[PDB]
């Protein structure tokens, strides 16, 4: 099989930037002329878009710019002005044989302005306490970098191993992410305390912002 | 314009059978140069696996041959995937992709939605709703908690409200299951002047919740 290896891997530019990721494939993908690579951007949830055919062909209605250069073994697609809608992984592809074969993908993001995360806390709902469990939710909304640390706190006691975070994909209206945080707990454990407090460290943050409430 | 609509995705125990089906509208099955199958295990790349060209030859990537055959339907306008000997890895979104007359053929410019197959002995469990109640801004949300396989769809007031709308991608919870939360922020005035509703809908399990949310 044809391997294909794209760099970089991801890549983070500031908004109407240029740029430019390669591909190597491992044999020559050149034909009579042409040579047969192609480029796909996959936006979160979505299938892949076809951005360029034949190394440099742009796609019907695909903005102009996108471009693609390069022949044999060495190819380069280059985004001219970055914006912010162009959050997405981009994949080479060879068509030369089969198995038509992809490259791993490069993750691309806006590099905006620090921003501070919202932060907001969550007690579980009494529907959810009649079921045995509680989940405690912290909310980091729109914040960038993507980069935080969130620290649960149980009657000022540092917790460990009993939450999990999720992370927002970018959202190109503002170039931002948000975050949750659960944590759980039995809810006999929950009725044993009464102060839970997520602490929320960030770059956008002079000092580590807490949100609390008390159980009652 | 060419439509491709995927369907016949879901949970299916080891050693199984699927059976993927692509409804083509808005253009004619026959005039395709090529219609091809390609997937993407969860946050992997995508891997091409079958084809067949408009003259019905075949063609199958070495990594599954043996228990893969696509085939077509020109009457109905649909072409079709069937796997068997199901194996975990085989757990994907599948879409199916049309290929081009033009430069080399083996590119793709019209892709389906895709439709997720899961290998598991794991059951169908639907997930429970709970509100994330609101404490200038403030924060309300949904908390989707327990439930298998993949996929749940949340909207707000029947999607009516969308900006501000954060639905986070699913975490895999140790016990197997999934949780996902869907949050919103709106204006603190509007708390009392207004109803916040989460719509969930988690098909495989034929689970459907409307959740007023508030203070």
């Known amino acids: 099989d044809i391997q294909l290896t794209q760099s970089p891997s991801s890549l983070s530019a500031s908004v109407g930037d240029r740029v430019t990721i390669t591909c190597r494939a491992s044999?020559?993908?050149?034909?009579?002329?042409?040579?047969?690579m192609n480029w796909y951007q996959q936006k979160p949830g979505k299938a892949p878009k076809l951005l360029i055919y034949a190394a440099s062909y742009l796609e019907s209605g695909v903005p102009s710019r996108f471009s693609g250069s390069g022949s044999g073994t060495d190819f380069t697609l280059t985004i001219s002005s970055l914006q912010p809608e162009d959050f997405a992984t981009y994949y080479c592809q060879q068509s030369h044989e089969d198995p038509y074969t992809f490259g791993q993908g490069t993750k691309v993001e806006i590099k905006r302005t620090v921003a501070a995360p919202s932060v907001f806390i969550f007690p579980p709902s009494d529907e959810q306490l009649k079921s045995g469990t509680a989940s405690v939710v912290c909310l980091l909304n729109n914040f960038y970098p993507r980069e935080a640390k969130v620290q649960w706190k149980v009657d000022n006691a540092p917790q460990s191993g009993n939450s999990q975070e999720s992370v927002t994909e970018q959202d190109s209206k503002d170039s931002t992410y948000s975050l949750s945080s659960t944590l759980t707990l039995s809810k006999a454990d929950y009725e044993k305390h009464k102060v839970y407090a997520c602490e929320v460290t960030h770059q956008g943050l002079s000092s580590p912002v807490t949100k609390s409430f008390n159980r009652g | 314009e060419v439509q491709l609509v995927e369907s016949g995705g879901g949970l299916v125990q080891p050693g199984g059978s699927l059976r993927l089906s692509c409804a083509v509208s808005g253009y004619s099955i026959t005039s395709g140069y090529s219609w091809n199958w390609i997937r993407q295990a969860p946050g992997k790349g995508l891997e091409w696996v079958a084809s067949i060209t408009y003259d019905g030859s075949t063609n199958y990537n070495p990594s599954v041959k043996g228990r893969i055959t696509i085939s077509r339907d020109d009457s109905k306008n649909t072409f079709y995937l069937q796997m068997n000997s199901l194996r975990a890895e085989d757990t994907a979104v599948y879409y199916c992709?049309?290929?081009?007359?033009?430069?080399?053929?083996?590119?793709?410019?019209?892709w389906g939605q895709g439709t997720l197959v899961t290998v598991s002995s794991a059951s169908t469990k639907g997930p429970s709703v709970f509100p994330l109640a609101p404490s200038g801004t403030a924060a309300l949300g949904c908390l989707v908690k327990d439930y298998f396989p993949e996929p749940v769809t949340v909207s707000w007031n029947s999607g009516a409200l969308t900006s501000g709308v954060h639905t986070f991608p699913a975490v895999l919870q140790s016990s197997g299951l999934y949780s996902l939360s869907s949050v919103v922020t709106v204006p603190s005035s509007s708390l009392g002047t207004q109803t916040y509703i989460c719509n969930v809908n988690h098909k495989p399990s034929n689970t459907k919740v409307d959740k007023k949310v508030e203070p």
């Open positions: 044999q020559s993908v050149d034909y009579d002329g042409d040579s047969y």
């Open positions: 992709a049309r290929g081009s007359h033009y430069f080399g053929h083996w590119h793709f410019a019209v």
